[PDB]
Amino acid sequence: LVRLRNEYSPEMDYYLSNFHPYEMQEMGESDTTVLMSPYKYASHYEYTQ
Amino acid sequence: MFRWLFLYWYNSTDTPSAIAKVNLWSYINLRLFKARLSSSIAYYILGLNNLELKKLKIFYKNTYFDYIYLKSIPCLFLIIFFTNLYLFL
Amino acid sequence: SWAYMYPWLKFIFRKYLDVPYYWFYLNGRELGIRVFFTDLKLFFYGITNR
Amino acid sequence: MHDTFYVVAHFHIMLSGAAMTGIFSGIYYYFNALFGVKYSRMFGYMHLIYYSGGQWVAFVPLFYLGFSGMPRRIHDYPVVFMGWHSMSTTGHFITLVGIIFFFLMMFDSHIERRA
Amino acid sequence: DPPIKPNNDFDLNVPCTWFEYEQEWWMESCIQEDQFNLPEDERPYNTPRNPHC
Amino acid sequence: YFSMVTGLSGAALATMIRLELAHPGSPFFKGDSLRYLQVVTAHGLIMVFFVVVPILF
Amino acid sequence: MDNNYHFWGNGDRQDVSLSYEDYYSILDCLLDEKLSPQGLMKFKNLHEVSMYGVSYVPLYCFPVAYGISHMLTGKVRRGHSGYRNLFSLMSVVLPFTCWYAYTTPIPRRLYTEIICSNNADGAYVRNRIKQQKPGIWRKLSQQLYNKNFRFPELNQDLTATEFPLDYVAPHKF
Amino acid sequence: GVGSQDILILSVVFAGISTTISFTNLLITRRTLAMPGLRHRRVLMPFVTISIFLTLR
Amino acid sequence: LITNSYDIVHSWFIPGLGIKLDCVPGRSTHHTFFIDNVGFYYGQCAEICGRYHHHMPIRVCALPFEHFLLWWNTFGLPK
Amino acid sequence: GFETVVPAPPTRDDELRMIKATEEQFLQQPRYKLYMNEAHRIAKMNHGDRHNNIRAHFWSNFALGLLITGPIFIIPFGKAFRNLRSGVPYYFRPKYVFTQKNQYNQDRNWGAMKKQIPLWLGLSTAYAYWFTDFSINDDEWLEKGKVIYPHQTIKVL
Amino acid sequence: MIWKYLQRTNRGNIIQAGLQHRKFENLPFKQNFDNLTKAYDLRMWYISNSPHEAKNLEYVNELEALHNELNYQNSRQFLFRTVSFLLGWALFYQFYELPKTYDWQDTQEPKHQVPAYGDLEEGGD
Amino acid sequence: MAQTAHQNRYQGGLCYAQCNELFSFWNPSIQQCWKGCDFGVGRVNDPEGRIEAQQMCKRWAAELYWTYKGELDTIKDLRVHADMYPTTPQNVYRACLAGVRRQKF
Amino acid sequence: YEAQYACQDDMFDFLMELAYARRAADNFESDFASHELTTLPTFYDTPKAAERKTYTY
Amino acid sequence: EERYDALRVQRRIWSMRFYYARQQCLYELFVDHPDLAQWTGTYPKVDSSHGFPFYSTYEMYRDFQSFAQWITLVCGIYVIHVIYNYMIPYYWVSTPLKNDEFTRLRMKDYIASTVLEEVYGISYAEWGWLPHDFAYNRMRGLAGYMHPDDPRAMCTSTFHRKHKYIEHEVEKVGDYHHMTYPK
Ligand SMILES: [Cu+2]
Ligand SMILES: [Cu+2]
Ligand SMILES: [Mg+2]
Ligand SMILES: [Zn+2]
Structure with missing residues (x-):
């Protein structure tokens, strides 16, 4: 169990490769509520204008 | 810009420690975009000293229609010949 | 709001529903795609005449 | 056997007996998770014995009546059924006694107050 | 904080060495409890060698 | 606990059903067939939808 | 031209042209008891050809409706992203293009055989359209007279001793 | 007649609404808030939970 | 047997013959009926119908054709 | 709609000749043609033969159509994917998947193929339906559904 | 013979297309949709074909700005075209003489409007 | 084929095959035709056996449906077609006779 | 007698009410029938109906 | 011999060409479209033998992953058989027909009413009918299937048969005193 701390030590940067990069698609504000297509739903993110 | 994870993680100087020493976290330096594989099969065998990276590439993806049409002429002529042969016999 | 227009939907597809199996030999006709292309040409002719 | 007490016996054995016995199995299996104390064995054994016996005694005579042509939703029936019906009712009351023991054990589980 | 069930990458697995020799043990021992074995006094021995081996 | 109360309710309805069927001649409802049918319907509905379904789900 | 000129559901330019709306309205004013078994056969063949045709017409009009709906949104193609506006405008415009198509007469051999046949079935159909569908017969009579058809039921009949039953639109004698 | 039967019909409507709420809540709880290793593996969960999710579907 | 019902669904249920015919409104259901013995069978209604669902009894007497003909000429023909 | 003279019921010799004709016609059915014994069977078989004939022609034309639709339509159509309407050469516009178009003209060639293969097949199908002839099987009045019996096909003795 | 113009593929179908210089010579003195789309x-x-990263990132920033400006131009186009379409639709149906002479048989059911089975719907025999 | 002699139509032989070929596959007349094949087993070749088989067909038709004494003796046309269904004793008789005609040996 | 056999007396009474309603007005079905114009063609719909049948001893 | 070896090698070559083209497609799908790869049941296909885990990996969604397949196939075949002859043919005739209406209705009904199982229901009647019960049910069946216009009586094994174990009433198959009675 590695108890990560709220710091910028080189020890924390050692575990930089054990995390998926954070997806930016859901960040910000969305101009589309949800896709009405059943084939591409809950897997694809909403498009933006 | 990285293609291989072992090159990406070998010696990285844009780590949070250094970037916090400067405290300027640019958007273009997101780790979501830093590394991306080649979409061509690449597996590992055991070489003479260490792991050897072997790439399995089978077919190209940039084929245009003229190649498909020229490679189909014998098949179309075979279809025509077989149908006419069936009609005659 | 488009819901109460279903009688047209039945009017189009029920006629497809009442087509028997081909090898029952009631008429021995399968005229789907033939009519598709023939009516494409016929609509070209009709629009040009109009 | 349609719309007769054979169907009633079938689905009552299934639903009442099996489903409620499995529910009680889960209740005793998760007694510490649900109540924070361990259950008492005496009234639990009494609950098990009486509930199971009541289920059998109450729903086997219903099979007997279903084989003899007893419709489902009639409150009056031919005289030749009463015998088994009485036995069936007896079984139900046995079941009820088991239910009592169930609640008793819960009370008995909080006098005990063990980890 | 959610609990975790860690998935292991197949490429990063290691050969089983935590008492690996016991995975089938129970199964075999359930089959050999009701098995009668021929004593070595009765098992034929020094049989002729296979010509090609 | 709500399911305990509803299960007691269903057990009471089943007790009414079994007391009407203890012997012929309608000893419980005394000739009122409609009340018996209401009791049977209520027993089935609250045992299925308001005892077992609440408990489990 | 085509290798299937024999087909009853086919036609050339100078065949009798009836729109689908006209065809259905004409069907609404006829009785099967008054038709010979040959006329019933013509009507049944026309029925199957026309059911396939009415099924297919929206498919014919879809490219034009798609283009018009795209041009109404603007000069930006937001594929998979402007689908909502595109298909609202489509559900509006495709009915209009289908209106233009379904009100457009199309020629057919069955159309020219049902109307212009010289037997009793043709006369029955012509008179039934003449009386129960005066406007449809007005258009159809103009078309038939323009195509060198000479029937008593036509409004443009110079050999008749009875006055026409409708307004005779101007035409070249 | 108007009475108990209408009570039963409208109570069944209400029970349908309650079941809708329940299955929506629990199905979305599984489909969204599952732990990182138990998102799709039916077998890993205890059998009562697999049964509950199947019955909710 | 052409089974039908005036108002609601009933069930002509003969346990001795092991048969049950559902009398459904608006449904003229045709059933074949064969009794291979001389027998007086009682029966009931096996579909919930109301107040007298319990007291809706049935009596069917299958007789040899001579006795059936005697009943038919004596009690059936005079209407 | 007149009527023909009804012959008297056949004698034993005529019945035997009819049986011989029926069995001889039965022997002629190929084992790979699975038509059951029925009144319309022969008629169906005839229909099937004609249908198969048409099928062959169609496919030939279809193949021919592909050839004729190769250089005449689809390749000149693919000449339209070289540049955009703004004059800038073709570049990849991704919908959802940001595929890496690393190869030379992967984006342009793939888009051209996506809009050309359906066009190729559609034009070939149109050519096949336009140029093949269905006249042999077409029956406007449905007069070819009449029952033909095996003994009527073959004359014996 | 036949292979010369049937098998010998044209040069243009193989190599990458070059820039059409005709379409960038005489440009209107406007920041209109055409010019913004060209940029x-x-x-x-x-940026899809350049190994140089500084110019690529500059063009990325400029492309975001152009995306915003083209969104504005498209908003203007959408407003004008759709308002014109709605007004034309309303005016057409204002001037169009709607055919109200359609058959009304669908609304009439004489067996149901006056129940033909009267006094027999309730069980009576 | 509850009224015929064989468990399945394939045991009937060539006569049952000809009966199947005589009528459309949904026509119940085939079974009656099959009964003809049963009546003319050892009788078709005998000159009086054929008459006996025809009489057997007449009796069979009279037993299946109510018939009148002259009704089966005044039939104008004994020929059958594919859509001839055994709705009348005349049709039953015609199907049975057609089955008798097709019984070689 | 066939119609009486196929129908119960209730449905027979309904159909007799319809028959009275249609016989008072003398409504022959051929006066209104047009659905044959919107029915698919069949081999049985040939103009020469008498010659479609093949007769064989 | 050598030709057989060449055929075997060619078959292996074809199989492996298909396999490796498919594997290239699957690897590209996993790298570029991770959610569709998971939905289709594709394993994480990136070789991480160098020790650095992949930046976008996922848990296997093995929805499809013997008896279940067999029983689903049997039920689906039964349902397709039912819809083939019971549902769809219901819509063929919906209006009164001028020509051969009874013929067309008979066709629709025959392709639905008469099923194959019925023949077996009497072809192996000894599996529950004793000799005397078989004789009585034989006379009963001959009476009940007396009506000629019944396509279900056709394609049903004959009642003019002796009991396989022993036959008491019937001495010969076709020695009767009445045509429509087995005695
Ligand atoms: Cu009752
Ligand atoms: Cu009742
Ligand atoms: Mg019931
Ligand atoms: Zn996806």
């Missing part, structure tokens, strides 16, 4: 296409093609 956007130029920068997108460049």
Whole structure:
């Protein structure tokens, strides 16, 4: 169990490769509520204008 | 810009420690975009000293229609010949 | 709001529903795609005449 | 056997007996998770014995009546059924006694107050 | 904080060495409890060698 | 606990059903067939939808 | 031209042209008891050809409706992203293009055989359209007279001793 | 007649609404808030939970 | 047997013959009926119908054709 | 709609000749043609033969159509994917998947193929339906559904 | 013979297309949709085929700005075209003489309007 | 084929095959035709056996449906077609006779 | 007698009410029938109906 | 011999060409479209033998992953058989027909009413009918299937048969005193 701390030590940067990069698609504000297509739903993110 | 994870993680100087020493976290330096594989099969065998990276590439993806049409002429002529042969016999 | 227009939907597809199996030999006709292309040409002719 | 007490016996054995016995199995299996104390064995054994016996005694005579042509939703029936019906009712009351023991054990589980 | 069930990458697995020799043990021992074995006094021995081996 | 109360309710309805069927001649409802049918319907509905379904789900 | 000129559901330019709306309205004013078994056969063949045709017409009009709906949104193609506006405008415009198509007469051999046949079935159909569908017969009579058809039921009949039953639109004698 | 039967019909409507709420809540709880290793593996969960999710579907 | 019902669904249920015919409104259901013995069978209604669902009894007497003909000429023909 | 003279019921010799004709016609059915014994069977078989004939022609034309639709339509159509309407050469516009178009003209060639293969097949199908002839099987009045019996096909003795 | 113009593929179908210089010579003195689209296409093609990262990132910023400006131009186009379409629709149906002479048989059911089975719907025999 | 002699139509032989070929596959007349094949087993070749088989067909038709004494003796046309269904004793008789005609040996 | 056999007396009474309603007005079905114009063609719909049948001893 | 070896090698070559083209497609799908790869049941296909885990990996969604397949196939075949002859043919005739209406209705009904199982229901009647019960049910069946216009009586094994174990009433198959009675 590695108890990560709220710091910028080189020890924390050692575990930089054990995390998926954070997806930016859901960040910000969305101009589309949800896709009405059943084939591409809950897997694809909403498009933006 | 990285293609291989072992090159990406070998010696990285844009780590949070250094970037916090400067405290300027640019958007273009997101780790979501830093590394991306080649979409061509690449597996590992055991070489003479260490792991050897072997790439399995089978077919190209940039084929245009003229190649498909020229490679189909014998098949179309075979279809025509077989149908006419069936009609005659 | 488009819901109460279903009688047209039945009017189009029920006629497809009442087509028997081909090898029952009631008429021995399968005229789907033939009519598709023939009516494409016929609509070209009709629009040009109009 | 349609719309007769054979169907009633079938689905009552299934639903009442099996489903409620499995529910009680889960209740005793998760007694510490649900109540924070361990259950008492005496009234639990009494609950098990009486509930199971009541289920059998109450729903086997219903099979007997279903084989003899007893419709489902009639409150009056031919005289030749009463015998088994009485036995069936007896079984139900046995079941009820088991239910009592169930609640008793819960009370008995909080006098005990063990980890 | 959610609990975790860690998935292991197949490429990063290691050969089983935590008492690996016991995975089938129970199964075999359930089959050999009701098995009668021929004593070595009765098992034929020094049989002729296979010509090609 | 709500399911305990509803299960007691269903057990009471089943007790009414079994007391009407203890012997012929309608000893419980005394000739009122409609009340018996209401009791049977209520027993089935609250045992299925308001005892077992609440408990489990 | 085509290798299937024999087909009853086919036609050339100078065949009798009836729109689908006209065809259905004409069907609404006829009785099967008054038709010979040959006329019933013509009507049944026309029925199957026309059911396939009415099924297919929206498919014919879809490219034009798609283009018009795209041009109404603007000069930006937001594929998979402007689908909502595109298909609202489509559900509006495709009915209009289908209106233009379904009100457009199309020629057919069955159309020219049902109307212009010289037997009793043709006369029955012509008179039934003449009386129960005066406007449809007005258009159809103009078309038939323009195509060198000479029937008593036509409004443009110079050999008749009875006055026409409708307004005779101007035409070249 | 108007009475108990209408009570039963409208109570069944209400029970349908309650079941809708329940299955929506629990199905979305599984489909969204599952732990990182138990998102799709039916077998890993205890059998009562697999049964509950199947019955909710 | 052409089974039908005036108002609601009933069930002509003969346990001795092991048969049950559902009398459904608006449904003229045709059933074949064969009794291979001389027998007086009682029966009931096996579909919930109301107040007298319990007291809706049935009596069917299958007789040899001579006795059936005697009943038919004596009690059936005079209407 | 007149009527023909009804012959008297056949004698034993005529019945035997009819049986011989029926069995001889039965022997002629190929084992790979699975038509059951029925009144319309022969008629169906005839229909099937004609249908198969048409099928062959169609496919030939279809193949021919592909050839004729190769250089005449689809390749000149693919000449339209070289540049955009703004004059800038073709570049990849991704919908959802940001595929890496690393190869030379992967984006342009793939888009051209996506809009050309359906066009190729559609034009070939149109050519096949336009140029093949269905006249042999077409029956406007449905007069070819009449029952033909095996003994009527073959004359014996 | 036949292979010369049937098998010998044309040069243009193989190599990458070059820039059409005719379409960038005489440009209108406007920041209109055409010019903005031309700039956007130029920068997108460049960043799709350029090994130089500084120019690529400059073009990325300029492409975001052009995306915003083209969104504004498209909003104007959408407003004008759709308002014109709605007004034309309303005016057409204002001047169009709607056919109200359709058959009304569908609304009439004489067996149901006056129940033909009267006094027999309730069980009586 | 509850009224015929064989468990399945394939045991009937060539006569049952000809009966199947005589009528459309949904026509119940085939079974009656099959009964003809049963009546003319050892009788078709005998000159009086054929008459006996025809009489057997007449009796069979009279037993299946109510018939009148002259009704089966005044039939104008004994020929059958594919859509001839055994709705009348005349049709039953015609199907049975057609089955008798097709019984070689 | 066939119609009486196929129908119960209730449905027979309904159909007799319809028959009275249609016989008072003398409504022959051929006066209104047009659905044959919107029915698919069949081999049985040939103009020469008498010659479609093949007769064989 | 050598030709057989060449055929075997060619078959292996074809199989492996298909396999490796498919594997290239699957690897590209996993790298570029991770959610569709998971939905289709594709394993994480990136070789991480160098020790650095992949930046976008996922848990296997093995929805499809013997008896279940067999029983689903049997039920689906039964349902397709039912819809083939019971549902769809219901819509063929919906209006009164001028020509051969009874013929067309008979066709629709025959392709639905008469099923194959019925023949077996009497072809192996000894599996529950004793000799005397078989004789009585034989006379009963001959009476009940007396009506000629019944396509279900056709395609049903004959009642003019002796009991396989022993036959008491019937001495010969076709020695009767009445045509429509087995005695
Ligand atoms: Cu009752
Ligand atoms: Cu009742
Ligand atoms: Mg019931
Ligand atoms: Zn996806």
